[PDB]
From a paper:
Bromodomains are protein modules recognizing acetylated lysines (Kac) in histones and other proteins. Here, we report on the identification of acetylpyrrole derivatives as dual BET‐BRPF1 (bromodomain and PHD finger containing protein 1) hit compounds with affinity values in the single‐digit micromolar range and selective over BRPF2 (aka BRD1) and BRPF3. To provide structural support we determined the high‐resolution crystallographic structures of some of the acetylpyrrole‐based hit compounds in complex with BRPF1 and BRD4 bromodomains. The compounds nicely adapt to the different pockets by assuming similar poses with their acetylpyrrole headgroup, but opposing orientations for their tails.
Author numbering: 627 to 739
The structure:
């Protein structure tokens, strides 16, 4: 229950804040399946911040939980695919932590709308 335009503005700002936490830009674009031929063997739904931006602009996120679910996929896919002793795995842990804080604040803003 709220106006659509301010909610989308909030999600755009939140998505920018989450991307800023991915300093290596390793989550900015889809995992290149040509370079990782086995990626889809066990990853059911790839996700990345560019796809999230597309989904946002296509009006596919109309509540906070659907936005947060796709962010959580970025994290969970990376934890699943990569071994614990890799930079990629630790980057996903760091994004989970830093992004979680961004998301809690953004949700508190939405609840005032
Ligand atoms: C495995 C994984 O989880 C990846 C995540 C989160 N991002 C990327 C990525 C984005 S862009 C790019 N570019 C090149 N040239 N590999 N790799 C990967 C695949 C990395 C390869 C080297 C195993």
């Amino acid at each position: 229950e709220m106006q659509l335009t301010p909610f989308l503005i909030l999600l755009r700002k939140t998505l920018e804040q989450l991307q800023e936490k991915d300093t290596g830009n390793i989550f900015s674009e889809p995992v290149p399946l040509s370079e990782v031929p086995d990626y889809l063997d066990h990853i059911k739904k790839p996700m990345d911040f560019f796809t999230m931006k597309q989904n946002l602009e296509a009006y596919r996120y109309l509540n906070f939980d659907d936005f947060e679910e796709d962010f959580n996929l970025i994290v969970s896919n990376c934890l699943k695919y990569n071994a614990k002793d890799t930079i990629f795995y630790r980057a996903a842990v760091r994004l989970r932590e830093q992004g979680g804080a961004v998301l809690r604040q953004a949700r508190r803003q939405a609840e005032k709308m």
